[PDB]
Write a protein that binds this ligand. Structure first.
Ligand SMILES: *[C@@H]1O[C@H](CO)[C@@H](O[C@@H]2O[C@H](CO)[C@@H](O[C@@H]3O[C@H](CO[C@H]4O[C@H](CO[C@H]5O[C@H](CO)[C@@H](O)[C@H](O)[C@@H]5O)[C@@H](O)[C@H](O[C@H]5O[C@H](CO)[C@@H](O)[C@H](O)[C@@H]5O)[C@@H]4O)[C@@H](O)[C@H](O[C@H]4O[C@H](CO)[C@@H](O)[C@H](O)[C@@H]4O[C@H]4O[C@H](CO)[C@@H](O)[C@H](O)[C@@H]4O[C@H]4O[C@H](CO)[C@@H](O)[C@H](O)[C@@H]4O)[C@@H]3O)[C@H](O)[C@H]2NC(C)=O)[C@H](O)[C@H]1NC(C)=O
Ligand SMILES: *[C@@H]1O[C@H](CO)[C@@H](O[C@@H]2O[C@H](CO)[C@@H](O[C@@H]3O[C@H](CO[C@H]4O[C@H](CO)[C@@H](O)[C@H](O[C@H]5O[C@H](CO)[C@@H](O)[C@H](O)[C@@H]5O)[C@@H]4O)[C@@H](O)[C@H](O[C@H]4O[C@H](CO)[C@@H](O)[C@H](O)[C@@H]4O)[C@@H]3O)[C@H](O)[C@H]2NC(C)=O)[C@H](O)[C@H]1NC(C)=O
Ligand SMILES: *[C@@H]1O[C@H](CO)[C@@H](O[C@@H]2O[C@H](CO)[C@@H](O[C@@H]3O[C@H](CO[C@H]4O[C@H](CO)[C@@H](O)[C@H](O)[C@@H]4O)[C@@H](O)[C@H](O)[C@@H]3O)[C@H](O)[C@H]2NC(C)=O)[C@H](O)[C@H]1NC(C)=O
Ligand SMILES: *[C@@H]1O[C@H](CO)[C@@H](O[C@@H]2O[C@H](CO)[C@@H](O[C@@H]3O[C@H](CO[C@H]4O[C@H](CO)[C@@H](O)[C@H](O)[C@@H]4O)[C@@H](O)[C@H](O)[C@@H]3O)[C@H](O)[C@H]2NC(C)=O)[C@H](O)[C@H]1NC(C)=O
Ligand SMILES: *[C@@H]1O[C@H](CO)[C@@H](O[C@@H]2O[C@H](CO)[C@@H](O)[C@H](O)[C@H]2NC(C)=O)[C@H](O)[C@H]1NC(C)=O
Ligand SMILES: *[C@@H]1O[C@H](CO)[C@@H](O)[C@H](O)[C@H]1NC(C)=O
Lengths: 53, 133, 130, 107, 108
């Protein structure tokens, strides 16, 4: 989301920071991981984990 | 190719139903959504509703839900009837077919798209007058 | 970081232009630039080297003017102490150019006393035509 | 209804009356009186086959652009009602075709 | 009045060469009082070198400066494609602050 910040004067010298408009689409925040890289790292973790169990 | 030709009486007394039908020639109901658009004098076009092969009747909320849109592949033709017609409902009635597109702006597994309808093949329209005179 | 100037101006000959310079576009900021640094005002006409107009002090907004601009330039700080202003009166077609504000310790900061316009801002294009 | 008048051989530029809030998909319709409505532009820029390469829409690239239909070299026949069916991502289902723009060619 | 003269107004070079830019003063500078500035059209001006030899904060090690008296040089060790701009020297130590005319770099 393209966020707009808005300053509100709430007291003498005091500014509250609000969210104003979203500019463009409303979308969800998200994270991406490479699927093959994550699977290979999980295999390495599983192999180091089988030495204890 | 898709041909489509409307049909209707044109002479309807107020406070009853009005039926306009739409016969499609050239092929069957393969690809298409089917929609109805009326145009009254003194104002612009007006989308009134659309259906598809799943028979999901979706109407304009601006037209009171007095409307019934149906179709059949036995006769292979479309049909429209609205209930309790007032004399302000005189208009040219166009039968049209609609393609659905999806506009994708983000992640599709989050549902960040929408569907839109483009009416590509139209018809001439029936000039249906409603009056008791 | 950066300096935020007002928008480009088109003026008549004999009029006045007023340019702003802020270190923060937040109107209710507490940035305290312009109480720590000197702010230079520097124009560049097309086809010329940069020309220095004046500098305003952090100390109580005391201005030093160039002698060729002294009779028609005013350098002001906002009473909120978070913006500085240039006012050039009696405009002529050779006053057209890009105007910059620049920020400088100006030999006044207590460890090393250096001199550098280290943060420049933007540039307001000023056109004088009729 | 919004009238707009353009001389022959010039370029007419019909703006959409509605503004998009978000990514749009804009259909442009041409409606002569007594004739059937004709789809000129769909998906903000795409012409269906059978539409001349004088109609253009503005593509939805780098949000902030207004949707305009551009008619280059307006004929005597290119005068009708023009509808901008505007769909976007923050407005829901677009039941309205919008207000028309009656083009008049001058001469 | 101190006048600064920058000797070649246009200078042509290939990306990866060593370039000398020169500033000549009318008198005797303090050498805490000479700086260099990068001007390109459509971009924010940037301090390159202050105090005749000190690099700025966002300034790479390919730039250095030297000089004394009335002779000052800004040398670029390896020319990059973003170093193709006008470079100005300016002098502190009296008002009006004066700039130096400018040496523009274009590629071969
Ligand atoms: C984490 O990972 C996830 C992965 O899950 C990432 O998620 C991705 O997030 C991005 C957003 O950041 C999404 O991007 C949007 O994608 C859509 C969908 O694109 C697909 O569909 C397009 C249309 O398909 C049409 O044609 C095909 C036949 O080709 C047909 O099958 C279909 O039915 C339909 O008819 C394809 O064009 C597109 O192809 C892309 O990839 C091809 C191969 O990779 C490549 O060859 C292509 O060149 C193209 O790049 C793909 O299959 C895009 O439509 C959308 O882009 C439009 O929207 C944005 C925002 O509105 C706009 O700014 C863009 O400029 C672009 O707008 C153009 O298209 C509109 C519709 O087409 C049109 O209305 C506009 O006017 C504008 O049109 C201009 O360009 C087009 C061509 O570009 C031209 O024809 C016009 O005339 C005009 O010039 C977004 O990019 C991803 O969908 C999403 N991925 C998934 C899997 O969900 C996430 O980002 C990651 N996060 C992080 C932090 O990393
Ligand atoms: C008040 O403000 C004024 C105005 O700035 C100050 O006056 C200047 O002070 C600076 C102090 O750094 C002076 O610079 C020094 O100059 C001396 C003497 O220069 C002569 O001797 C040199 C031999 O060493 C010779 O090379 C010089 O020739 C160059 O300069 C002339 C111009 O003067 C030029 O025409 C030539 O072509 C040459 O380019 C010149 O004949 C010099 O000895 C100093 O060098 C030392 O320091 C530098 C850097 O620190 C170092 O690199 C050297 O190796 C050497 O160790 C230094 O350059 C400047 O000359 C003064 N200018 C004027 C106009 O007066 C004044 O000092 C201020 N007062 C106070 C109290 O602050
Ligand atoms: C998030 O939304 C922002 C809107 O609030 C987007 O900012 C816009 O970005 C474009 C280009 O990225 C800018 O277009 C430029 O405009 C200037 C002239 O504008 C000047 O004047 C306005 C007010 O008059 C001022 O607000 C600007 O800051 C400028 O000082 C041209 O010179 C450029 O060539 C270019 O056309 C928009 O001006 C800008 N709008 C605002 C309000 O800042 C931002 O791009 C969005 N971000 C993302 C990632 O989508
Ligand atoms: C806190 O409150 C203060 C008091 O209301 C605010 O200060 C005033 O803000 C207004 C609007 O920004 C300024 O008016 C502007 O003046 C400039 C030019 O200044 C000349 O004219 C004014 C009268 O307008 C005169 O008083 C001066 O001496 C100058 O001769 C114009 O270009 C503008 O169009 C606008 O009219 C006031 O000048 C300003 N100061 C005072 C003392 O009233 C202050 O902005 C508030 N702070 C915050 C952070 O919001
Ligand atoms: C995370 O973002 C980085 C960019 O910071 C992506 O890395 C780039 O990937 C493309 C295509 O694979 C390469 O051409 C670039 O050279 C990569 N590096 C940079 C700096 O752009 C990476 O693909 C992203 N990862 C995920 C999982 O989305
Ligand atoms: C991860 O790798 C293992 C072995 O390499 C494989 O059995 C498994 O299917 C992989 N999982 C995914 C999600 O790729």
């Amino acid at each position: 989301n393209n966020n707009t910040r808005k300053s509100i004067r709430i007291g003498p010298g005091q500014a509250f920071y609000a969210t104003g408009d979203i500019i463009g689409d409303i979308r969800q925040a998200h994270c991406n991981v490479s699927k093959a890289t994550w699977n290979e790292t999980l295999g390495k973790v599983v192999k180091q984990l089988r030495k204890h169990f | 190719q898709v041909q489509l030709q409307e049909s209707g009486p044109g002479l309807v007394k107020p406070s009853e139903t009005l039926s306009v039908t739409c016969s499609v020639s050239g092929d069957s109901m393969n690809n298409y959504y089917w929609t109805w658009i009326r145009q009254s004098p003194g104002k612009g076009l007006e989308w009134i509703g659309y259906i598809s092969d799943r028979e999901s009747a979706t109407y304009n909320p601006s037209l009171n839900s007095r409307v019934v849109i149906s179709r059949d592949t036995s006769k292979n033709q479309l049909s429209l009837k609205l209930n309790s017609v007032t004399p302000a409902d005189t208009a040219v009635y166009y039968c049209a077919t609609a393609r659905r597109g999806q506009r994708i702006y983000g992640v599709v597994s989050f549902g960040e798209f929408f569907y839109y309808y483009s009416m590509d093949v139209w018809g001439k329209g029936t000039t249906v007058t409603v009056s008791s005179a | 970081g950066r300096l935020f100037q007002s928008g480009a101006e088109v003026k008549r000959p004999g009029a006045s232009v007023r340019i702003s310079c802020r270190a923060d576009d937040d109107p209710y900021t507490d940035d305290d630039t312009f109480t720590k640094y000197w702010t230079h005002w520097i124009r560049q006409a097309p086809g010329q080297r940069p020309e220095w107009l004046g500098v305003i002090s952090p100390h109580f907004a005391r201005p030093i003017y160039s002698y060729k601009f002294r009779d028609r330039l005013t350098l002001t700080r906002d009473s909120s102490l978070t913006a500085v202003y240039l006012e050039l009166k009696g405009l002529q077609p050779d006053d057209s150019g890009i105007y910059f504000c620049a920020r400088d310790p100006f030999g006044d900061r207590a460890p090393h006393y250096n001199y550098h316009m280290d943060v420049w801002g933007g540039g307001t294009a000023v056109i004088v035509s009729s | 209804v919004r009238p707009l008048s353009v001389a022959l051989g010039e370029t007419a530029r019909i703006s959409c009356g509605r503004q998009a809030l978000g990514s749009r998909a804009v259909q442009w319709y041409q409606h002569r009186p007594g004739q059937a409505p004709i789809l000129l532009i769909y998906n903000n820029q795409d012409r269906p086959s059978g539409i001349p390469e004088r109609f253009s829409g503005t593509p939805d690239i780098n949000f902030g652009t207004r949707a305009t239909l551009t008619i280059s070299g307006v004929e005597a026949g290119d005068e009708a009602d023009y509808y901008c069916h505007m769909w976007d991502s923050r407005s829901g289902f677009s039941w309205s075709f919008g207000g028309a723009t009656r083009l008049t060619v001058l001469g | 009045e101190v006048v600064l003269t920058q000797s070649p107004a246009i200078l042509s070079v290939s990306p990866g060469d060593r370039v000398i830019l020169s500033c000549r003063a009318s008198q005797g500078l303090d050498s805490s009082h000479l700086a260099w500035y990068r001007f390109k059209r459509g971009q924010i001006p940037t301090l390159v070198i202050f105090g005749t030899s000190n690099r700025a904060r966002g300034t790479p090690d390919r730039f250095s400066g030297s000089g004394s008296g009335a002779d000052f040089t800004l040398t670029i060790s390896r020319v990059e494609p973003e170093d193709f701009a006008t470079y100005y020297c300016q002098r502190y130590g009296g008002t009006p602050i004066t700039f130096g005319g400018g040496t523009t770099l274009d590629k071969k």
